[PDB]
Design a protein around this ligand. Structure first.
Ligand SMILES: [Zn+2]
Ligand SMILES: [Zn+2]
Lengths: 74, 320
C-alpha cells in the first residue's frame, strides 16, 4: 500500500544545449592565376556564357585545357 | 605521390606496393642534382647565317636537354625548357658571348622543365646587373605550376620547394598590388607573355629579330598546354615532350589524354621531312625518320585508317 505523498527537495534545472553557427572564419589562401578581364566567353557544348566589357582594342587568350575558354584583353 | 588520407593509410596494398617497388626502404629515392663531376660542357649544335643553336644533353637526372637560340644580328638569346642542374655555365657563356637574355620559352611546366627556373632567372639577372628576363608559357600549365611543390616532394628536390615560381607572380595580365603609400623586383613582372592555344601559321609567332620568326604550336596530350617551337627558315622543330627518337611522350601522368596526343601527332604531317626535330629528352631526329621508323605514329595512322573514331596513342614508360 501507499501511505504518503512525498516530493524530492532537490530541484534540478535542465541544461539547455543548442548548436548555433556563431563564428564565421574561413581560410582563403589559394595558388591560382587571377586576371584582369575585359571579356570572357565560356563555350562548353551545353552552356555558352558571353560577358563583355567594352573597349577600343582587345586581345585574345584561348584555353582548351578543359573546355573552350576565350578571354578578351587577358 | 599523393596526399596520405585515412583510406591510403589503412590500405595493405599500399604497403605491399611500397615494398615491391623500393624493397626494404619503402621510400622512393628522389631525382638528385647532377654533381660537378660527370657533367659535360655546352655544345654549339647548329651555326647558321641567321641563328645559332647551342645545347647541352643530359643536364638533369630526368635526362632532359637544355637549348638556347642566339640571334646573330641583335645579340639576343632565348632559352627553351630551362632545366639545367648547373645554370652557371650558361650565364658565363652568355657573359663571354656578350649576349642579352630577354625571354625563356617553356613548352610545359612539368618538373623536368622548370626545376631550376628561379636559379636561371636569378643568376642571369645578377649578371645583367653588372629590363629583366621574361617567361613565355601557356596558362593551362597553371594546373602544373601549383603542383610544382608536390612534384618537388616526391622527387626529393627539397631546396627548390619553398620558391615562388616567376609564372605565379603578378604580370600585366593580372591585377596589381595596392601597396601602402609609404619594391618592383617581385611585385610586377612587365616582361611576361601568355601564349594562346589558338595557334596558326599567320600570327602565332615571336619576332626573334633579323626576320627570324618562331611559330609556337599548341599540341596537348603530354600536358594541357604544350607549345612546340617551329622555325621553318632553319627547319628546326623544338618538340619538347611530344616526339622523341623512336618514341613519343607519356600519357600515364595527370592531365594527359591519349586522344589529345594523337591529334597533336596528326597536326604535324604538313612539315617537310628534312625538318630536324629537337626533343626535350634524348637524341635528335628528323620528322621523315619519325614518319618512317616510329611505331607510335604507325599505330596512330593505322587506327585512323581501320576506322577508330577516338584514336588514343601514348607511352606509359618513358620520359616525364
Ligand atoms: Zn613533360
Ligand atoms: Zn620532358
Amino acid at each position: 500500500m501507499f501511505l504518503i505523498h512525498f516530493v524530492h527537495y532537490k530541484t534540478i534545472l535542465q541544461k539547455y544545449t543548442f548548436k548555433f553557427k556563431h563564428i564565421f572564419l574561413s581560410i582563403d589562401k589559394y595558388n591560382s592565376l587571377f586576371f584582369n578581364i575585359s571579356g570572357i566567353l565560356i563555350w562548353l557544348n551545353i552552356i555558352h556564357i558571353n560577358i563583355i566589357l567594352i573597349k577600343y582594342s582587345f586581345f585574345i587568350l584561348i584555353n582548351n585545357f578543359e573546355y573552350l575558354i576565350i578571354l578578351i584583353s587577358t | 605521390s599523393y596526399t596520405p588520407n585515412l583510406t591510403s593509410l589503412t590500405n595493405q596494398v599500399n604497403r605491399s606496393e611500397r615494398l615491391r617497388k623500393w624493397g626494404s626502404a619503402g621510400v622512393p629515392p628522389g631525382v638528385p642534382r647532377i654533381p660537378r663531376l660527370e657533367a659535360k660542357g655546352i655544345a654549339i649544335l647548329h651555326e647558321s647565317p641567321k641563328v645559332i643553336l647551342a645545347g647541352r644533353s643530359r643536364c638533369n637526372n630526368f635526362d632532359s636537354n637544355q637549348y638556347m637560340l642566339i640571334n646573330k644580328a641583335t645579340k639576343r638569346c632565348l632559352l627553351v625548357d630551362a632545366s639545367d642542374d648547373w645554370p652557371d655555365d650558361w650565364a658565363a657563356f652568355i657573359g663571354a658571348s656578350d649576349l642579352t637574355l630577354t625571354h625563356v620559352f617553356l613548352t610545359h611546366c612539368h618538373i623536368d622543365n622548370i626545376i631550376n627556373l628561379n636559379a636561371f632567372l636569378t643568376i642571369c639577372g645578377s649578371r645583367q646587373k653588372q629590363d629583366e628576363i621574361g617567361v613565355m608559357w601557356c596558362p593551362a600549365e597553371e594546373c602544373w605550376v601549383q603542383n610544382f611543390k608536390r612534384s618537388c616532394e616526391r622527387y626529393g628536390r627539397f631546396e627548390e620547394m619553398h620558391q615562388v615560381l616567376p609564372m605565379m607572380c603578378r604580370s600585366l595580365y593580372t591585377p596589381q598590388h595596392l601597396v601602402d603609400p609609404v619594391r618592383n623586383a617581385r611585385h610586377l613582372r612587365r616582361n611576361d607573355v601568355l601564349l594562346s592555344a589558338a595557334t596558326n601559321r599567320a600570327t602565332s609567332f615571336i619576332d626573334f629579330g633579323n626576320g627570324v620568326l618562331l611559330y609556337y604550336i599548341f599540341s596537348p596530350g603530354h600536358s594541357p598546354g604544350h607549345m612546340m617551337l617551329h622555325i621553318p627558315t632553319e627547319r628546326i622543330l623544338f618538340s619538347g615532350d611530344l616526339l622523341f627518337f623512336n618514341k613519343v611522350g607519356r600519357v600515364d601522368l595527370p592531365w594527359a589524354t591519349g586522344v589529345r596526343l594523337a591529334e597533336s601527332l596528326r597536326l604535324l604531317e604538313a612539315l617537310p621531312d628534312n625538318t630536324v626535330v629537337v626533343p626535350g629528352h634524348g637524341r635528335m631526329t628528323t620528322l621523315g625518320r619519325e614518319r618512317r621508323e616510329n611505331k607510335a605514329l604507325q599505330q596512330c595512322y593505322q587506327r585512323q585508317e581501320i576506322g577508330k573514331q577516338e584514336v588514343s596513342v601514348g607511352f606509359n614508360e618513358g620520359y616525364l
